Amino acid sequence: GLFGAIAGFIEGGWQGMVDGWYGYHHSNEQGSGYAADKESTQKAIDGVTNKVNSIIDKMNTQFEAVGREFNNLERRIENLNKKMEDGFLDVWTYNAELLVLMENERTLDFHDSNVKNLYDKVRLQLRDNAKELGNGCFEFYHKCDNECMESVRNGTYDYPQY
Amino acid sequence: GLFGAIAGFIEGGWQGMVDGWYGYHHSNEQGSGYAADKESTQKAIDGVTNKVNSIIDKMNTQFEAVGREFNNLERRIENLNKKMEDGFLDVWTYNAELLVLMENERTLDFHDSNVKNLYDKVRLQLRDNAKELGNGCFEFYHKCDNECMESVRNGTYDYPQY
Amino acid sequence: GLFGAIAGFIEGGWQGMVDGWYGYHHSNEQGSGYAADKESTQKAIDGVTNKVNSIIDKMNTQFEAVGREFNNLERRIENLNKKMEDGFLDVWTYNAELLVLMENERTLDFHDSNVKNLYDKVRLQLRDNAKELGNGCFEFYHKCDNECMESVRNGTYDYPQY
Amino acid sequence: DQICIGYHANNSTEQVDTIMEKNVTVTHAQDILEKTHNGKLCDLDGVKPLILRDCSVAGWLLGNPMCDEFINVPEWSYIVEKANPVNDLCYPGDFNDYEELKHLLSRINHFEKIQIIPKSSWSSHEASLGVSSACPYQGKSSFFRNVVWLIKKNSTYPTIKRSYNNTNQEDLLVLWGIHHPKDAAEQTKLYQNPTTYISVGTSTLNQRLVPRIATRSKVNGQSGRMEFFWTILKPNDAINFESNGNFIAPEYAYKIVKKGDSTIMKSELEYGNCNTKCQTPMGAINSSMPFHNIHPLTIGECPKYVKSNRLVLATGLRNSP
Amino acid sequence: DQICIGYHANNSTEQVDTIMEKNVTVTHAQDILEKTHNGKLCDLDGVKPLILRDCSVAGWLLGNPMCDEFINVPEWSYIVEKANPVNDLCYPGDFNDYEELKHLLSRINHFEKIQIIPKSSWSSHEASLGVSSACPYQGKSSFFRNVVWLIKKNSTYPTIKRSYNNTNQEDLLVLWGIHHPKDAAEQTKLYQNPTTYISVGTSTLNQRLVPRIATRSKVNGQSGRMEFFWTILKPNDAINFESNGNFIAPEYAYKIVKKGDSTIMKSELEYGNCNTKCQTPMGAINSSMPFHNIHPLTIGECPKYVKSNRLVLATGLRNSP
Amino acid sequence: DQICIGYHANNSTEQVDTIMEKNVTVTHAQDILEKTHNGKLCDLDGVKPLILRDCSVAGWLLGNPMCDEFINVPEWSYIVEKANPVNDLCYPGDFNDYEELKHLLSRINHFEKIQIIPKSSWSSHEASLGVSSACPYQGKSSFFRNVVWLIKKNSTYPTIKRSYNNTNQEDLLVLWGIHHPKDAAEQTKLYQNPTTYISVGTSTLNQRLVPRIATRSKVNGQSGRMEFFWTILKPNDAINFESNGNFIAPEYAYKIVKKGDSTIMKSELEYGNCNTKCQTPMGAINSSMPFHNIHPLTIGECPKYVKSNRLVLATGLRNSP
Ligand SMILES: *[C@@H]1O[C@H](CO)[C@@H](O[C@@H]2O[C@H](CO)[C@@H](O[C@H]3O[C@H](CO[C@H]4O[C@H](CO)[C@@H](O)[C@H](O)[C@@H]4O)[C@@H](O)[C@H](O[C@@H]4O[C@H](CO)[C@@H](O)[C@H](O)[C@@H]4O)[C@@H]3O)[C@H](O)[C@H]2NC(C)=O)[C@H](O)[C@H]1NC(C)=O
Ligand SMILES: *[C@@H]1O[C@H](CO)[C@@H](O[C@@H]2O[C@H](CO)[C@@H](O[C@H]3O[C@H](CO[C@H]4O[C@H](CO)[C@@H](O)[C@H](O)[C@@H]4O)[C@@H](O)[C@H](O[C@@H]4O[C@H](CO)[C@@H](O)[C@H](O)[C@@H]4O)[C@@H]3O)[C@H](O)[C@H]2NC(C)=O)[C@H](O)[C@H]1NC(C)=O
Ligand SMILES: *[C@@H]1O[C@H](CO)[C@@H](O[C@@H]2O[C@H](CO)[C@@H](O[C@H]3O[C@H](CO[C@H]4O[C@H](CO)[C@@H](O)[C@H](O)[C@@H]4O)[C@@H](O)[C@H](O[C@@H]4O[C@H](CO)[C@@H](O)[C@H](O)[C@@H]4O)[C@@H]3O)[C@H](O)[C@H]2NC(C)=O)[C@H](O)[C@H]1NC(C)=O
Ligand SMILES: *[C@H]1O[C@H](CO)[C@@H](O[C@@H]2O[C@H](CO)[C@@H](O[C@@H]3O[C@H](CO)[C@@H](O)[C@H](O)[C@@H]3O)[C@H](O)[C@H]2NC(C)=O)[C@H](O)[C@H]1NC(C)=O
Ligand SMILES: *[C@H]1O[C@H](CO)[C@@H](O[C@@H]2O[C@H](CO)[C@@H](O[C@@H]3O[C@H](CO)[C@@H](O)[C@H](O)[C@@H]3O)[C@H](O)[C@H]2NC(C)=O)[C@H](O)[C@H]1NC(C)=O
Ligand SMILES: *[C@H]1O[C@H](CO)[C@@H](O[C@@H]2O[C@H](CO)[C@@H](O[C@@H]3O[C@H](CO)[C@@H](O)[C@H](O)[C@@H]3O)[C@H](O)[C@H]2NC(C)=O)[C@H](O)[C@H]1NC(C)=O
Ligand SMILES: CC(=O)N[C@H]1[C@H]([C@H](O)[C@H](O)CO)O[C@@](OC[C@H]2O[C@@H](O)[C@H](O)[C@@H](O)[C@H]2O)(C(=O)O)C[C@@H]1O
Ligand SMILES: CC(=O)N[C@H]1[C@H]([C@H](O)[C@H](O)CO)O[C@@](OC[C@H]2O[C@@H](O)[C@H](O)[C@@H](O)[C@H]2O)(C(=O)O)C[C@@H]1O
Ligand SMILES: CC(=O)N[C@H]1[C@H]([C@H](O)[C@H](O)CO)O[C@@](OC[C@H]2O[C@@H](O)[C@H](O)[C@@H](O)[C@H]2O)(C(=O)O)C[C@@H]1O
Ligand SMILES: *[C@@H]1O[C@H](CO)[C@@H](O[C@@H]2O[C@H](CO)[C@@H](O)[C@H](O)[C@H]2NC(C)=O)[C@H](O)[C@H]1NC(C)=O
Ligand SMILES: *[C@@H]1O[C@H](CO)[C@@H](O[C@@H]2O[C@H](CO)[C@@H](O)[C@H](O)[C@H]2NC(C)=O)[C@H](O)[C@H]1NC(C)=O
Ligand SMILES: *[C@@H]1O[C@H](CO)[C@@H](O[C@@H]2O[C@H](CO)[C@@H](O)[C@H](O)[C@H]2NC(C)=O)[C@H](O)[C@H]1NC(C)=O
Ligand SMILES: *[C@@H]1O[C@H](CO)[C@@H](O)[C@H](O)[C@H]1NC(C)=O
Ligand SMILES: *[C@@H]1O[C@H](CO)[C@@H](O)[C@H](O)[C@H]1NC(C)=O
Ligand SMILES: *[C@@H]1O[C@H](CO)[C@@H](O)[C@H](O)[C@H]1NC(C)=O
Ligand SMILES: *[C@@H]1O[C@H](CO)[C@@H](O)[C@H](O)[C@H]1NC(C)=O
Ligand SMILES: *[C@@H]1O[C@H](CO)[C@@H](O)[C@H](O)[C@H]1NC(C)=O
Ligand SMILES: *[C@@H]1O[C@H](CO)[C@@H](O)[C@H](O)[C@H]1NC(C)=O
């Protein structure tokens, strides 16, 4: 992806994180586990939802074909009618398919971006109190118990304390 | 935003920076203040201006309706005419609204990108001669007077000197 | 570019790297030279190729004009016919030109992204065993012979070894 | 001790397409294209369609003897007609401005048939011998029930002069016709007068028809032809007829009581005993999807038609193997 | 000591929409949709339109006595006609190929009226008694000023044979007509001859009209009808008339001197005493915007019409609270 | 010691446009718009077109003496006709429903001319004096070769009654006509009978033509006119003629043997001695590009037409100075 996180420096996703789209996995002497980041997850749900509704709504006003009949000596206008109706269908079919392709690409990149930004957010807190391993993970120099871990997820990681 | 700077790790903009879109705020013993980055700002003005003109120009050739009248026994072709004219209006209305939505998203992201790149540019000069605070700011280990500050804005920050 | 690498912190491209789109240049006591990154290059070729074919294919079904003639007292429907045929040409001309502009922008940004990610990949391996110079280059603290260099291109750079 | 940043994966096999890559497996997706229908013709919002079956709009309106099922049809939502209905014009001929009338019907939901010129009131002409083997009913020769084929009485066809005044509130559809005979002998045999005409007038209308004679091939065993005409008589307006012969006089005409959204749908299907909010010629649609690919000609509250086989939006993210 | 990187904020409340988010406040924006008009009909580039007021194109061209305002109109930029002009055909009837002629006018900016067959030159027929109460002028019976309703003189309507040769450089619009009488008595009363016709020929044209008789409802107190016809006589071509009666002969015809961009605009508005570069049926536009949403039918150098209520592009960036 | 990350540059000057920037130099690009053609009319997939040269579709089909080149044309791929072919209707007149017939031809690749009413079989009428100076052939007066201008024999034009039965498998295009004379004297001079007609009937058709007389301008030195008509006679159906005079009888009619994709292309160009898979009125196209900008009206396996001057996609990346 454009942002390098999803299937990039973070090799794969987590079956074990069930309660959100992005989040944290911690590992210390007390144990280990997954925790979803609420804020970035809800941000993602709002954006994607607004997008779907934006897509649906923009295609609201669109060509509707009507039945018209013509006799045996009105072939020219019958053909005109047919070419007119088909012309608009092809145009709206193109619009719909292209919009889906273009916005699907942007949806995947958007998720990649949200992960990258969450990773940077944590990197910018920890700074030089942890080793950046290169795979999404940070190895602490000090012991980091569950309250220590929580402060990282908080945004409250007290850097001068360590 | 996709790039994480604007309303991301940089929480908010500056009312006090009046002379450009992006720039620097310095703070030392001599005082403090704002300075716009000329290059990145002018880059942004050129891109957005070209975009507007590109948008305006692409919508230049577009359907123009003409008046046509039909008698009481020409209802079929009158309907054809109406469906034809409305069909094209709906298509061009869709095109215009979708283009504005899509390019507005890209304009906001573009600005976010320009800020992120300006931030990285400075980070890459300072390296380990300053603390990356996590909020857009860099705290120097040495004293950095106004000429020192200017060299950062220059691109000329002499790293071996400190 | 949006990602800051191409014509950003990497000032310019390399005439000397002939065998790929992105890659490495090494410099030590044994000598120097260019080596293309196979994986990221082939990734780029697949994406751009799929894009071209996607573009070509989406424009496959599109309006085809047919010849219709009208007598001297059928001016209204003749005009209708002409406005209909021109209307669709303008629509498809717009679609084609806009798609090329939009996707050209995304193609250039895509390359920029691939370079940025390759740069980060290497940065994340080397960590603090090298100086990040700010121009695409990393200056090693230890001697890095050709096998050492190869391990960087590998993904196998043994960090604890140095 | 470490903390890691990551993202969701699951057992999903849903795939989406992008410009640069096809068949990307994602954790979540949303299909937006309706692909299914029930294959039936149904009531639209409870209001049953008019299903003409083997009859055409002409057979129906003129009153083809084989189309008695539709002698007095109630309000309809839409109309269904086969591609080649067999019970059209039983006596061969033409229906003038037929397509313009069918178009007029797409803005009509209900007709009320009323008698404007009684069959009994033709005291100087023979009104009960206007039949043919081309229009059979229960083994016997009959004719279009809504018009009266008038012929000579006691070897005399005196000039007809009839006027009807539209005293109804509703616009009135009036139908009449002209008989084109085989040869000069048949003309005098049926109508006496060798040179005849039909003149029709209203507020706007100014018509004068003359019977055209020619040798013609036998359709339904007839060399003669019937050419049928119509008009919309507005309220407080009068229609005026005058004729020497060959006149197919109106008996019944249709009041236009309800004008609204309708359509004539071409289909070979029959009634489904069914209800829907969106109907196509191939079957009805019950869907909350914004798009469908069943058929372009629909009626009701429908999704937008596209020619796609597949439209699926990504909502989640790239799923891991 | 520190240095910070940041971005601009200001007091802006301008908002823009995106795919993923609506009503994003930005520092700078550019509206590209014109929403306002002046509500008036105006001169287009100084050149005043032809405002027919209560007259129709037919009333104008045929010379309805109530339409003397337009006896000799100067060059126009566009034409304005009401939806239901009251001064149309004063004597009831039809205008043949009326719509095809109105279409022809959209490529015309100026007519020059000239006399092709003088009123005085009808020495064998009565040319000054061709009037009706249906076409009143100052309380007296009058008639379409550009055509001459000819009747019998001293109980005789001899065959008319008139020819006009287009010696002008310009294409010529020629108008004529046929009178459809109430009954056989009126026919002989006005024209003597019971069976009449009008034959019209040109290089291309090959016409022969016959008056159709019928009982008709009274429009403007008339049971008779006038059917009007036209043609474009090319330079060096001649038009030929022949008739037994019922002929409504041309007196004046229009030269086509200026061909160019024009249109017939449907509107109830009157002249605004005004100037503009872009006109709509609802009012004129003075804007540098690339789009507008006033009305689809425009003339002049205009923005492109869209159905949007709002089109606003972001230029600046996301503004901070 | 150092390792650097970088990207490719080369000597390319290819440029592409984006929304925000024009003329960006890139390392690699792909042009997708075909701009060139060969400027010739060519065989389509080996199958030569019908190039009418100075003849029109009417001159061809009616058999204008100057159009003998096309007396029996083989199968064609498409048809080419000039904007103003000089050899149209040699004797002036009209071709009824001409455009609807030309449209019918766009679904036809091959005609087979056959004789339905022999010239010799007119034993009661003069069939070999139906000529004019308006239709010259080798300095002598001739006529449309496929129809027979019948006149009186020994001062008598008895009523014609002819029938042809379509025993062929193919639909048959039948052409006939009516002569409109200058004056009453010419009518009796050619046909004796002052009041004549032509009645034409088929399964569907019910026609009766009458000659219209008028003073007319001289086109090709003729004041008389010929009005031509046509129909498609389906298999096992019979066409029936009856007439007093002015009848232009069919001799040859065209079988419709091959129905398929075709078109009538307007062009002043001649045959190129050439082959192509895609043809335009300006010349043919040999390209693998998905788009072209030559001309909108094409036939064959073609790229899609757009109005662009330039369509170039970036494949590589931004090239360095
Ligand atoms: C088909 O038939 C219908 C009726 O069966 C015809 O409509 C009627 O036509 C007659 C003329 O033949 C008109 O007669 C007179 O009626 C009005 C009545 O006034 C008003 O109030 C009543 C309330 O009941 C209402 O029905 C009317 O609509 C109207 O608003 C008279 O005022 C008028 O008489 C006038 O007297 C004036 C002096 O007092 C004179 O100056 C006038 O010149 C005039 O003589 C009128 O003549 C009916 O008005 C009319 N009714 C309706 C409902 O239309 C219809 O015309 C016919 N069609 C055809 C084609 O013949
Ligand atoms: C309506 O009226 C107009 C005129 O009022 C008619 O147009 C004219 O028609 C007459 C025939 O009736 C033609 O007469 C002769 O004139 C030309 C003159 O030559 C040229 O130079 C003059 C310069 O002033 C120019 O006006 C002409 O346009 C032309 O280029 C004669 O050459 C010609 O006479 C020929 O003589 C030859 C031997 O010398 C013979 O071989 C020829 O057969 C021929 O007899 C010609 O006959 C006018 O040419 C013509 N003028 C114009 C301007 O059109 C018009 O025809 C009429 N319409 C109808 C439907 O009747
Ligand atoms: C133009 O000419 C053609 C022929 O030149 C006309 O078509 C023919 O019309 C005649 C009537 O005039 C019909 O005659 C009889 O032929 C069938 C034969 O049966 C079948 O098998 C043969 C196999 O060779 C096949 O040709 C036929 O198509 C058919 O399938 C008879 O069965 C039938 O006679 C019937 O006898 C019954 C009792 O046995 C009676 O109940 C019936 O009432 C009927 O009398 C029939 O009459 C031909 O069928 C017909 N041939 C074709 C190929 O169309 C054509 O009609 C004419 N056009 C016009 C407008 O006049
Ligand atoms: C996010 O997480 C950090 C770390 O868990 C939070 O700090 C902790 O907050 C808890 C709950 O408020 C504190 O518990 C309280 O401690 C006081 C003093 O001992 C006691 O009187 C109360 O009864 C209660 O037990 C805890 O002391 C504190 N721990 C640390 C190491 O700071 C922080 O509040 C959270 N911040 C946000 C924004 O969510
Ligand atoms: C960007 O900013 C840096 C830091 O301000 C610039 O370096 C400074 O440039 C000034 C102006 O040229 C120098 O002033 C001159 O100093 C010399 C020697 O004392 C004197 O002879 C002149 O009269 C003048 O005062 C100043 O020395 C220098 N300071 C430092 C610390 O380097 C730099 O030139 C700028 N570069 C760019 C690309 O804008
Ligand atoms: C990527 O590159 C690194 C560094 O070049 C590779 O490590 C090197 O791999 C080579 C080839 O397999 C090894 O050579 C072998 O050495 C053994 C032991 O001396 C010898 O028995 C064999 O005959 C052969 O010469 C070499 O030892 C090794 N060097 C180092 C410093 O690790 C690595 O294998 C590559 N990995 C990938 C994924 O491409
Ligand atoms: C009102 C009337 O005259 N009805 C006749 C009818 C008409 O005269 C005729 O259709 C007008 O063109 O003709 C009917 O006989 C014709 C009929 O005779 C059968 O024997 C034969 O089988 C048929 O081919 C056909 O010729 C008719 O039935 O139409 C009788 C009717 O009473
Ligand atoms: C040229 C001429 O004959 N003018 C007559 C005209 C025509 O005869 C008639 O319109 C042709 O159909 O008729 C006029 O009288 C008819 C008129 O009489 C009034 O009294 C009555 O009020 C009206 O309803 C109507 O019948 C006419 O004015 O049209 C007289 C005119 O001189
Ligand atoms: C079948 C026949 O009658 N052919 C005549 C033909 C017709 O009578 C006439 O075209 C019907 O309208 O007329 C021909 O002479 C007319 C011709 O005479 C020349 O001298 C003169 O140069 C021409 O202007 C024209 O008047 C004809 O050639 O058309 C003779 C033909 O035999
Ligand atoms: C992406 O997946 C679709 C759906 O499975 C593939 O469509 C199938 O393609 C194969 C081979 O072309 C056919 O045998 C099947 O009939 C197709 N199935 C359906 C349901 O359409 C498609 O080919 C794949 N595309 C790519 C580029 O890999
Ligand atoms: C975005 O802002 C617009 C403009 O204020 C909102 O439009 C208003 O919506 C409210 C509630 O629906 C209505 O009462 C007003 O009539 C609307 N005003 C105008 C000028 O249109 C819109 O609802 C907002 N949209 C979202 C998603 O928040
Ligand atoms: C981008 O390059 C194109 C192609 O060179 C330029 O087009 C030329 O423009 C100049 C000046 O307007 C003209 O003299 C030439 O006739 C044009 N050449 C062609 C082949 O079209 C274009 O102007 C450039 N656009 C921008 C924005 O710099
Ligand atoms: C996938 O996992 C979900 C848990 O959300 C479960 O409900 C479903 O049965 C699973 N499906 C398969 C095929 O394993
Ligand atoms: C349509 O389908 C839904 C299932 O999504 C069903 O619950 C509902 O009853 C159906 N409605 C009708 C009118 O058939
Ligand atoms: C916003 O600030 C600008 C300064 O550029 C000033 O001109 C304007 O008056 C201010 N508006 C409000 C409402 O404060
Ligand atoms: C149009 O409006 C502008 C204001 O933007 C004004 O200055 C100009 O005078 C106006 N032009 C006309 C022709 O009314
Ligand atoms: C550009 O370089 C290529 C090498 O790939 C060479 O073939 C070509 O001749 C060069 N063109 C120019 C103009 O230098
Ligand atoms: C078309 O052009 C190609 C060159 O791209 C050439 O090789 C081929 O022979 C041409 N085909 C025809 C039918 O002219």
Side-chain angles (χ1 to χ4, degrees), chain E residues 156-166:
Chain E
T156 314
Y157 200 113
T159 309
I160 292 164
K161 287 173 182 164
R162 275 297 231 293
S163 180
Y164 171 77
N165 176 315
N166 190 12

PDB file of all heavy atoms in Angstrom, chain E residues 156-166:
ATOM      1  N   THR E 156     -68.857  35.899 -60.247  1.00  0.00           N
ATOM      2  CA  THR E 156     -67.918  35.134 -61.073  1.00  0.00           C
ATOM      3  C   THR E 156     -66.569  35.023 -60.376  1.00  0.00           C
ATOM      4  O   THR E 156     -66.014  36.028 -59.935  1.00  0.00           O
ATOM      5  CB  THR E 156     -67.684  35.787 -62.454  1.00  0.00           C
ATOM      6  OG1 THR E 156     -68.934  36.181 -63.030  1.00  0.00           O
ATOM      7  CG2 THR E 156     -66.991  34.818 -63.405  1.00  0.00           C
ATOM      8  N   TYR E 157     -66.053  33.800 -60.269  1.00  0.00           N
ATOM      9  CA  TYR E 157     -64.686  33.571 -59.806  1.00  0.00           C
ATOM     10  C   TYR E 157     -63.934  32.854 -60.927  1.00  0.00           C
ATOM     11  O   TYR E 157     -63.954  31.623 -61.005  1.00  0.00           O
ATOM     12  CB  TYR E 157     -64.668  32.747 -58.514  1.00  0.00           C
ATOM     13  CG  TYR E 157     -63.372  32.857 -57.713  1.00  0.00           C
ATOM     14  CD1 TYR E 157     -63.354  33.468 -56.462  1.00  0.00           C
ATOM     15  CD2 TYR E 157     -62.171  32.350 -58.208  1.00  0.00           C
ATOM     16  CE1 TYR E 157     -62.185  33.568 -55.727  1.00  0.00           C
ATOM     17  CE2 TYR E 157     -60.995  32.443 -57.478  1.00  0.00           C
ATOM     18  CZ  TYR E 157     -61.004  33.055 -56.239  1.00  0.00           C
ATOM     19  OH  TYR E 157     -59.838  33.150 -55.508  1.00  0.00           O
ATOM     20  N   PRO E 158     -63.293  33.627 -61.820  1.00  0.00           N
ATOM     21  CA  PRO E 158     -62.525  32.997 -62.889  1.00  0.00           C
ATOM     22  C   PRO E 158     -61.221  32.413 -62.360  1.00  0.00           C
ATOM     23  O   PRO E 158     -60.739  32.828 -61.304  1.00  0.00           O
ATOM     24  CB  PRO E 158     -62.261  34.151 -63.863  1.00  0.00           C
ATOM     25  CG  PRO E 158     -62.287  35.374 -63.018  1.00  0.00           C
ATOM     26  CD  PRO E 158     -63.271  35.099 -61.916  1.00  0.00           C
ATOM     27  N   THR E 159     -60.667  31.451 -63.092  1.00  0.00           N
ATOM     28  CA  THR E 159     -59.445  30.775 -62.676  1.00  0.00           C
ATOM     29  C   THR E 159     -58.302  31.778 -62.537  1.00  0.00           C
ATOM     30  O   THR E 159     -58.038  32.556 -63.455  1.00  0.00           O
ATOM     31  CB  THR E 159     -59.032  29.680 -63.683  1.00  0.00           C
ATOM     32  OG1 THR E 159     -60.143  28.813 -63.940  1.00  0.00           O
ATOM     33  CG2 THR E 159     -57.868  28.854 -63.147  1.00  0.00           C
ATOM     34  N   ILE E 160     -57.648  31.760 -61.377  1.00  0.00           N
ATOM     35  CA  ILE E 160     -56.478  32.598 -61.112  1.00  0.00           C
ATOM     36  C   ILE E 160     -55.224  31.869 -61.580  1.00  0.00           C
ATOM     37  O   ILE E 160     -55.084  30.670 -61.358  1.00  0.00           O
ATOM     38  CB  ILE E 160     -56.355  32.928 -59.606  1.00  0.00           C
ATOM     39  CG1 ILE E 160     -57.510  33.837 -59.177  1.00  0.00           C
ATOM     40  CG2 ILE E 160     -55.015  33.591 -59.297  1.00  0.00           C
ATOM     41  CD1 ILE E 160     -57.719  33.925 -57.682  1.00  0.00           C
ATOM     42  N   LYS E 161     -54.325  32.593 -62.241  1.00  0.00           N
ATOM     43  CA  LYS E 161     -53.026  32.054 -62.648  1.00  0.00           C
ATOM     44  C   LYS E 161     -51.960  33.122 -62.446  1.00  0.00           C
ATOM     45  O   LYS E 161     -51.751  33.972 -63.313  1.00  0.00           O
ATOM     46  CB  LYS E 161     -53.048  31.605 -64.111  1.00  0.00           C
ATOM     47  CG  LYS E 161     -53.824  30.323 -64.370  1.00  0.00           C
ATOM     48  CD  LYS E 161     -53.945  30.032 -65.860  1.00  0.00           C
ATOM     49  CE  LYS E 161     -54.767  28.778 -66.124  1.00  0.00           C
ATOM     50  NZ  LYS E 161     -55.213  28.681 -67.544  1.00  0.00           N
ATOM     51  N   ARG E 162     -51.297  33.081 -61.294  1.00  0.00           N
ATOM     52  CA  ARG E 162     -50.300  34.084 -60.951  1.00  0.00           C
ATOM     53  C   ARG E 162     -48.939  33.462 -60.705  1.00  0.00           C
ATOM     54  O   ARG E 162     -48.832  32.374 -60.135  1.00  0.00           O
ATOM     55  CB  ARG E 162     -50.734  34.860 -59.711  1.00  0.00           C
ATOM     56  CG  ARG E 162     -51.662  36.026 -59.995  1.00  0.00           C
ATOM     57  CD  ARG E 162     -51.000  37.093 -60.861  1.00  0.00           C
ATOM     58  NE  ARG E 162     -51.133  38.428 -60.281  1.00  0.00           N
ATOM     59  CZ  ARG E 162     -52.280  39.092 -60.146  1.00  0.00           C
ATOM     60  NH1 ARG E 162     -53.432  38.562 -60.545  1.00  0.00           N
ATOM     61  NH2 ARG E 162     -52.277  40.300 -59.597  1.00  0.00           N
ATOM     62  N   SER E 163     -47.902  34.179 -61.126  1.00  0.00           N
ATOM     63  CA  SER E 163     -46.532  33.733 -60.966  1.00  0.00           C
ATOM     64  C   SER E 163     -45.673  34.859 -60.402  1.00  0.00           C
ATOM     65  O   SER E 163     -45.768  35.996 -60.848  1.00  0.00           O
ATOM     66  CB  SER E 163     -45.977  33.281 -62.314  1.00  0.00           C
ATOM     67  OG  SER E 163     -44.636  32.847 -62.190  1.00  0.00           O
ATOM     68  N   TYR E 164     -44.851  34.544 -59.403  1.00  0.00           N
ATOM     69  CA  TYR E 164     -43.850  35.486 -58.919  1.00  0.00           C
ATOM     70  C   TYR E 164     -42.456  34.870 -59.011  1.00  0.00           C
ATOM     71  O   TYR E 164     -42.247  33.721 -58.627  1.00  0.00           O
ATOM     72  CB  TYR E 164     -44.135  35.930 -57.488  1.00  0.00           C
ATOM     73  CG  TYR E 164     -42.992  36.725 -56.910  1.00  0.00           C
ATOM     74  CD1 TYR E 164     -42.793  38.054 -57.266  1.00  0.00           C
ATOM     75  CD2 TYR E 164     -42.083  36.137 -56.039  1.00  0.00           C
ATOM     76  CE1 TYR E 164     -41.732  38.782 -56.752  1.00  0.00           C
ATOM     77  CE2 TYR E 164     -41.020  36.854 -55.519  1.00  0.00           C
ATOM     78  CZ  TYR E 164     -40.848  38.174 -55.876  1.00  0.00           C
ATOM     79  OH  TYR E 164     -39.789  38.877 -55.352  1.00  0.00           O
ATOM     80  N   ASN E 165     -41.514  35.662 -59.514  1.00  0.00           N
ATOM     81  CA  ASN E 165     -40.137  35.240 -59.722  1.00  0.00           C
ATOM     82  C   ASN E 165     -39.255  35.924 -58.690  1.00  0.00           C
ATOM     83  O   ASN E 165     -39.229  37.152 -58.619  1.00  0.00           O
ATOM     84  CB  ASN E 165     -39.721  35.625 -61.143  1.00  0.00           C
ATOM     85  CG  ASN E 165     -38.264  35.318 -61.458  1.00  0.00           C
ATOM     86  OD1 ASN E 165     -37.362  35.588 -60.668  1.00  0.00           O
ATOM     87  ND2 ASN E 165     -38.033  34.761 -62.649  1.00  0.00           N
ATOM     88  N   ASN E 166     -38.545  35.131 -57.887  1.00  0.00           N
ATOM     89  CA  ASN E 166     -37.651  35.679 -56.868  1.00  0.00           C
ATOM     90  C   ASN E 166     -36.392  36.267 -57.499  1.00  0.00           C
ATOM     91  O   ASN E 166     -35.408  35.556 -57.736  1.00  0.00           O
ATOM     92  CB  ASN E 166     -37.277  34.615 -55.829  1.00  0.00           C
ATOM     93  CG  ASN E 166     -36.551  35.201 -54.630  1.00  0.00           C
ATOM     94  OD1 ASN E 166     -36.513  36.421 -54.445  1.00  0.00           O
ATOM     95  ND2 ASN E 166     -35.968  34.331 -53.804  1.00  0.00           N
TER      96      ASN E 166
END
